[PDB]
Amino acid sequence: ASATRVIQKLRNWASGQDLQAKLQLRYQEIAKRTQPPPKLPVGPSHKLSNNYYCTR
Amino acid sequence: KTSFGSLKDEDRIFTNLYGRHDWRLKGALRRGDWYKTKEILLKGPDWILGEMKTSGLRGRGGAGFPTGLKWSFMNKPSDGRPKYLVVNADEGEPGTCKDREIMRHDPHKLVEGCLVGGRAMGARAAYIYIRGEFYNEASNLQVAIREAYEAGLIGKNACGSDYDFDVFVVRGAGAYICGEETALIESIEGKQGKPRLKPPFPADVGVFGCPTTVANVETVAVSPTICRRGGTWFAGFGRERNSGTKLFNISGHVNHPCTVEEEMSVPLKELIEKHAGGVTGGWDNLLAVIPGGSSTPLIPKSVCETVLMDFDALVQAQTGLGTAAVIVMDRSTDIVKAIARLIEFYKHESCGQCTPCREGVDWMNKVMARFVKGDARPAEIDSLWEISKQIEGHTICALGDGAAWPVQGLIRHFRPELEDRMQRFAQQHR
Ligand SMILES: Cc1cc2nc3c(=O)[nH]c(=O)nc-3n(C[C@H](O)[C@H](O)[C@H](O)COP(=O)(O)O)c2cc1C
Ligand code: SF4
């Protein structure tokens, strides 16, 4: 992403593809390594009634 | 007859219910006790059992099982063992005082009923297991028994009928579960008040391992009046299969809480407004009624409008006729607090022998306390219903049933009250 315009034009012409649009090196668009804490949902059997194990 | 009530004083059995006359032997002889009982004993066991059957009397203890058939379960030749009649005077159930009243005011009726039932089944002794808190009642019973022994009505010649019978009185030590049949038998036998399983039934293996029959004080005391006046008269009182008279203890939010003797099948509204002086604040102020003691569930005013006091009538009303203890609760009643107090009573009085009653009644007590505080979420109502259904029918005795039933009645009827309390708690914290 730090390549000059001359080198970018040379690479684009030499490969035939727009390379700066799809760079294989991740710079800033990736997710943060620190994330907010999650709250995972519970399944269908997490109920206090009509949940006898013989019925499932 | 299609309308029941307005019982006549010439037909009331417990003529000294209020203690206005002498409770001793002289007063009992004036009131008509111990009359022709020698002739009854000479007519013998099969005639008395037939009289009880044609009277159609049901157990006053709670279950209501037909007294004639239950007493005819011991109509067998002896296998070398003695046979015993036992009187359940425990009266542990809340709302109930009728057995206490008839023990302390008509004790000779109880003694004559013990003699009649013991002869009808074939027996040498009647053990009256009285509640340990009824010390004065036990002393009055012993005074009456001493009077009967001195008069020769009991002991080595049962009124000159060549029958031998002894009436003992044994006191409990404060356990509601000792009012149960088999737990009472164990308490007499000297162990803890833990009920034993059936089979064996007490008619085969009972107190000390003999054939025995536990019967209610009211049932035993109305037995000789049934024998004297005939079973047809007692069956003529009351409806079909729910016959005779009954002692109703009306307590709670009524103007005159009292114990009265009334004909069976009486309307609840008529009974309350006639004998209790009505609900405090009025019938419109009435909210709920527990009609048969704390074992039976509650019923709201809408079904209390036209309900009767039969076993079958309360069964159709999804309740039962237990000890005929009518607890009345008005609009000012904290209904959830009352039911949680009943569940706390059952938690304190469960004997803890068997796992569903023990653990589940403790669980219901905790859940009901949180329901009173409002400290739960409304799925716990259905959870508590499922817990009560797990308790009911899976226990050794019927205390688990009698603890699951009030929770079931409260959930069945006053569920929006619970939900309103719970959402109010949720909104005043969040
Ligand atoms: C927990 C529990 C407590 C009971 N307490 C009494 C009691 O105090 N007095 C009583 O007469 N019956 C009581 N019963 C009902 C007895 O089972 C019943 O009275 C006894 O079997 C005699 O039957 P009867 O009603 O035909 O006389 C209780 C039952 C249970 C399950
Ligand atoms: S149901 Fe309760 S009171 Fe009855 S035997 Fe079980 S633990 Fe004891």
Instruction: Give the Cα separation of B424 and B416 in Å (integer).
Output: 12
Torsion B149-B150-B151-B152 (CA) sign: positive
Q: Which helix (H) or strand (E) holds B361?
A: helix B355-373
Q: Say whether A48 and B385 touch across the interface (CB within 8 A).
A: no
Q: Are B277 and B257 in contact (CB under 8 A)?
A: no
The minimum CA-CA distance between A45 and chain B, rounded to whole Å, is 13
B266 and B365 share one domain: no
Q: For position B355, which CATH number holds?
A: 1.20.1440.230
Instruction: Give the Cα separation of B139 and B142 in Å (integer).
Output: 5
Peptide bond into B200 cis (omega under 30): yes
The minimum CA-CA distance between B379 and chain A, rounded to whole Å, is 6
Q: Which helix (H) or strand (E) holds B141?
A: helix B135-151
Pocket of ligand 2 contains residue B141 by CB under 6 Å: no
C-alpha B131 to ligand 2 mean position (Å): 19
Instruction: Give the Cα separation of B383 and A51 in Å (integer).
Output: 10
Of A46, A56, A54, the C-alpha closest to B383 is A46
C-alpha B361 to ligand 2 mean position (Å): 10
Nearest ligand (C-alpha, residue B356): 2
Q: Are A48 and B379 in contact (CB under 8 A)?
A: yes
DSSP letter (8 states) at residue B241 = T
Look at residues B287, B307, B333 and tell me which one is the last residue of a structural domain. B333
B126 and B223 share one domain: yes
SS3 of B197, please? coil
The answer for residues whose C-beta is within 8 angstroms of residue B59's C-beta and 6 or more apart is B65, B66, B67, B70, B215, B216, B219
Instruction: Give the Cα separation of B63 and B58 in Å (integer).
Output: 8
B417 and B285 share one domain: no
Torsion B332-B335-B339-B344 (CA) sign: negative
B263 and B176 share one domain: no
SS3 of B37, please? helix
> N- to C-terminal Cα distance for chain B?
60
B340 and B274 share one domain: no
Strand pairing partners for B216?
B88
B287 and B180 share one domain: no
B277 and B367 share one domain: no
Pocket of ligand 2 contains residue B195 by CB under 6 Å: yes
Residues spanned by the domain of B68: 57-236
Counting the structural domains of chain B, the total is 4
Instruction: Give the Cα separation of B7 and B3 in Å (integer).
Output: 11
CB neighbours (10 Å) of residue B76? 13
B125 and B220 share one domain: yes
Residue type, B377: R
Q: Which helix (H) or strand (E) holds B276?
A: none
Q: For position B285, which CATH number holds?
A: 3.10.20.600
Pairing between β-strand B325-330 and β-strand B245-252 as defined by DSSP bridges: parallel
Comparing alpha-carbon positions, the chain B residue that sits nearest to A47 is B379
Strand pairing partners for B84?
B125, B212
In the block, tokens 């929770």 appear at B407
Instruction: Give the Cα separation of B115 and B159 in Å (integer).
Output: 10
CB neighbours (10 Å) of residue B20? 8
Strand pairing partners for B167?
B126
Resolution (A): 3.0
Q: Is B378 on the interface with A (CB under 8 A)?
A: no
C-alpha B327 to ligand 1 mean position (Å): 19
Phi-psi region of B180 (alpha: psi -120 to 50; beta: other; left: phi over 0): beta
Of B37, B44, B40, the C-alpha closest to B148 is B37
